[PDB]
Each structure stands twice: as structure tokens, then as C-alpha cells.
């Protein structure tokens, strides 16, 4: 290993945000602190000086952004309440207002978070699992945190993936979320502006490991068209990808890359098929220096490739 890699919690929560190829990756260190590594032409940071806050050991870690002007990172306190580490350009890092509400969730809850796409002002939807094992939406619409729509029951401790995009022929944002139900299937729920939440679950995978990591992204929004990619850790100790492509639907799935048993997963994307993209980046643990976080890359030039073998601080 390396001294730096040793500071990374084994099976750490992982989150990532980006403005095109300007990247931030969040993880938890062995002391419970949440740290930020970054890519700005090269990889840096992830050290004890790059701590944005503290969370319970083993906490989920979720993050979302508006470019890199506004970043929000969500974790659980020791008290199993949702908290928010917030960054705005010109202000820096601070404790976000979500913590004031002190929302208790299940101790084993995961978290997903999105800024809603294409809206006039900043709007956030956070998803977590309550002690009754239902998936609850929490909203920020500019005037305090409030519970939004309850999305019903899921496997206790389920992974939660989420994405928001705006169809260019609609006047409001769409949301897709993915999680695991008691039957061990992975499923999607969906919000569109003209329908609200659709009543049905859409199966994306028949049987997944219990509490497997789930991470999602979307890109290339157009007129009634979108592209999406969902990632999870399968029973073969590899990340699998499920593809939604416009005109083909959920048409393919397969292995991507090996991971450690019980690795967490994060995904970011940028660009689109129309402009020599997309670019995809996955972050996970595959045993590099034992506990380092590694990267997988997809791009138009070279397709599927391992990227940075060990993120900072490794
Ligand atoms: O533009 C983003 C960068 O793309 C490739 O160069 C990767 O090797 C690198 O780790 C980073 O993801
Ligand atoms: O624009 C986003 C910001 O970029 C750098 O300033 C980082 O040091 C900071 O933590 C944040 O990620
Ligand atoms: O614009 C988004 C908002 O930014 C700050 O006001 C936060 O305190 C709040 O929780 C939310 O994240
Ligand atoms: O626009 C997104 C939607 O915003 C509100 O209407 C929420 O009640 C709903 O669950 C969803 O998040």
C-alpha cells in the first residue's frame, strides 16, 4: 500500500461531481472525515487538509453540483441525521442548511442527490431511506428544506442512484431514481413534468446482491430523448452497466470492471454522442494499494479503459 492509500476507508462511500473535465471526488477517511480529491489538468488533494466535514464512520456519501460553482455533499451524522457540506464560488465551504432540519433516517440509509436540470433557480432533491424502509424525497426550493414525495418501500439498506435532466420540448425537469426492492430486483422510478411520478416500477436487473451500490448518470437530453447509464456491483464482484439509449430503451447490460467485494461506486459524465462524447468516469475500489480509489474511463477516442490507478492521496 502507500501511507496515503491507507488513509482511505475500505468500502468508503464515494461521490463525484464535475463541470465537463474538471472533476471532484469525495470519499471518507479512516477517521470519518469527508475529503475532496480533484482533477484540474492533473490529480491533486485528498489529504487531511482537504477535509470538508465529518460524518459517521461508514456513512453514505452523495454529491451534486451546478458546474463547479455550487457543490453539495450529503452524508449522515453520528445521530443518523442528514447533513450537507456546501460550496459556493466566492464563499467556500460551509455547513449547509439541510442540517438545521436534523432529519433522522434509517442508520443503514444510503443517499442520492440532484440539482434539478434546467430550472431558473437552484432546486435540490435528496433521496434517503426512513426507518420504515420507504424512500423519501427531501426538497429545497429556495425557502427551507421540506419532505417531498414518498416513493414507497425498498430493501433496507438499498443503494440509491438518481439523475435529473430536462427534455428540451418540456418546461420542467425530469427525475429518474434507482433502488433495490425486497425481491432483490433493481428498479427505476420516474418523474416527468407532465405526469408527476409514474406509478410503476421498471425493472433494470432481475437479481442483485443485497445492498449493492447503485450509481447513475444521464446525458444528451433533447426533444423527448435522453441517454442514461446505471452502475451497480454484481455478484461476480464487478461493476455492471445498464444502458438506456434513445430509440432503443433499456437494451443492454454487461460487466465493466472488477471491484473489491462490497465496493461503493460513483459515476460522472459530460458531453454527448452528438459532440464527440459522451465521456464517462467511474470511481470505486478495486484493491489498488489495497484501499485506494481507482478510476475507469470511457470516451470516444479509446472506449473502455482503466484511468487513474490510485486517486490522491494514494
Ligand atoms: O479529463 C479527465 C481526465 O481524463 C483522462 O485523462 C483520465 O486519465 C484522467 O484521470 C481524468 O479522468
Ligand atoms: O470550484 C470548486 C472548488 O474548486 C477548488 O477551489 C477546491 O479547492 C474546492 O474545494 C472546490 O472543489
Ligand atoms: O441553493 C441551495 C442552498 O444553498 C444554501 O442556502 C444551503 O444552506 C441550502 O441548504 C441549499 O443547499
Ligand atoms: O419538479 C420535481 C418535482 O418537484 C415537486 O413537485 C415534488 O413534489 C416532486 O416529488 C418532484 O421532486
UniProtKB/Swiss-Prot annotation:
Family as reported in the entry's similarity comment: Belongs to the fungal fucose-specific lectin family.
Effect of inactivating the gene: Increases lung infection and lung injury by A.fumigatus.
GO molecular function terms attached to this record: carbohydrate binding; metal ion binding
UniProt binding sites for alpha-L-fucose 5: 229, 241
Keyword Kinase attributed: no
Sequence positions that bind alpha-L-fucose 6: 43, 281, 295
Protein name: Fucose-specific lectin
Binding site residues for alpha-L-fucose 3: 125, 137, 149, 197
Pfam families for the chain: Fungal_lectin (PF07938)
Record GO biological process: adhesion of symbiont to host cell surface via host glycoprotein
